[PDB]
Amino acid sequence: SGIHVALVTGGNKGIGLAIVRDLCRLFSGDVVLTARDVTRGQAAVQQLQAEGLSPRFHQLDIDDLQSIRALRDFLRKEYGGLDVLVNNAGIAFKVADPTPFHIQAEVTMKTNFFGTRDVCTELLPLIKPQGRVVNVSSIMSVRALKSCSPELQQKFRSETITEEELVGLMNKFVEDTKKGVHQKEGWPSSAYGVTKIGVTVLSRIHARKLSEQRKGDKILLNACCPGWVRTDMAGPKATKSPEEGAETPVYLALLPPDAEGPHGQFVSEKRVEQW
Ligand SMILES: NC(=O)C1=CN([C@@H]2O[C@H](COP(=O)(O)OP(=O)(O)OC[C@H]3O[C@@H](n4cnc5c(N)ncnc54)[C@H](OP(=O)(O)O)[C@@H]3O)[C@@H](O)[C@H]2O)C=CC1
Ligand SMILES: CC(C)(C)n1nc(-c2cccc(O)c2)c2c(N)ncnc21
Ligand SMILES: CC(C)(C)n1nc(-c2cccc(O)c2)c2c(N)ncnc21
């Protein structure tokens, strides 16, 4: 019977902000906007208040384990857990950024894969029955999968892969870039794309454990692509507004209590894609 709660990571701008706004109107309970920068997060909450909405705020940097754990403790204390988690935070380097490629790989992987993973380690145990988890991946993960060796494709499509095996492979990509050997070892050229392979596969693994370990709790967990969205990441020439980009993530967050699925899927335009 307690009040329900939804939370979005990377909520101060871009798709994440639009997701928060829609959950404020459509989610029955509190909605927590989180942001790594407290100033930007509070400004975004003030923006939504000027629109008539009442999100809560909590700081969260998915790359700081102490930030994650403080949020965990807040959720336990204030709500006794969590109903909806949207792992939206992510980064990408632009074309021709002068940062060395192996550092771009390390940095992008650190946030998009390892930060996401650490949020899930701490917050998935808090998800309540009928909860939903939404991981914002990218269609670039499907695109990058095709460019992997056959051996890595089999590993990434496996229904038996463990989280610890995936972790090893994600770190292997990054180390291989530093050694100048990633393509020889079967990896694609796109570092961002490999990080999103990690998000997609992590989603599949976490869904399988939910089915294995929490039969009966009616939790649904999926990965998704929001499409090509005008944000600071993609720039102003992209196809969709943030409002449009939010639609598939919000759909997946708000799947009705009696939904049988999707679960463990990669979803774009509200439709399941083959992995
Ligand atoms: N735009 C697009 O076309 C597409 C985007 N995506 C994915 O959608 C998600 C949102 O992207 P988008 O809105 O475009 O990007 P933006 O750059 O506009 O927004 C990214 C959000 O993530 C936050 N963030 C980044 N790193 C961290 C971190 N360490 N801890 C907490 N928050 C963090 C940012 O905070 P801050 O303001 O402090 O930087 C910001 O709130 C990402 O996962 C992206 O990979 C997928 C497909 C397409
Ligand atoms: C119907 C939903 C809940 C998606 N929605 N969206 C919006 C909306 C409209 C314009 C921009 C935006 O971000 C959201 C909205 C509104 N203004 N009033 C009532 N419901 C609204
Ligand atoms: C630059 C192109 C047009 C190839 N692009 N970029 C993206 C893109 C931009 C930023 C992040 C991301 O994951 C993907 C994209 C997309 N989601 N769908 C279709 N085309 C896309």
Author numbering: 2 to 276
Wording from the paper:
The carbonyl reductase CBR1 was first isolated from brain and has been associated with two cellular functions: (1) detoxification of xenobiotics, such as the anthracycline daunorubicin and (2) metabolism of ketone-containing cellular messengers, such as prostaglandin E. Genetic studies that have intended to uncover the in vivo function of this enzyme have focused on the xenobiotic detoxification activity of the enzyme. Using matrix-assisted laser desorption/ionization (MALDI) and electrospray ionization (ESI) MS/MS sequencing, B1–B3 were each identified as human CBR1, a member of the short-chain dehydrogenase/reductase family of NAD(P)(H) oxidoreductases. CBR1 converts daunorubicin into daunorubicinol, a compound that lacks the anti-proliferative activity of the parent daunorubicin and is cardiotoxic. We used affinity purification to identify a target of hydroxy-PP, carbonyl reductase 1 (CBR1), a short-chain dehydrogenase-reductase.
The structure was solved by molecular replacement with the AMoRe program using a modified porcine carbonyl reductase model and refined with SHELXL to 1.24 Å with a crystallographic R-factor of 10.3% and a free R-factor of 13.4%. Hydroxy-PP binds to the substrate-binding site of CBR1, with the pyrazolopyrimidine core of hydroxy-PP mainly surrounded by hydrophobic residues (Trp229, Met141, and Ile140). The phenolic hydroxyl group of hydroxy-PP, however, points deep into the substrate-binding pocket and interacts with Tyr139 and Ser193 of the catalytic triad. The phenolic oxygen is positioned 2.5 Å from Oη of Tyr139 and 2.5 Å from Oγ of Ser193, thus indicating strong hydrogen bonding. Importantly, structural analysis of the hydroxy-PP–CBR1 co-crystal structure revealed a small space in the active site capable of tolerating a methyl substituent at this position.
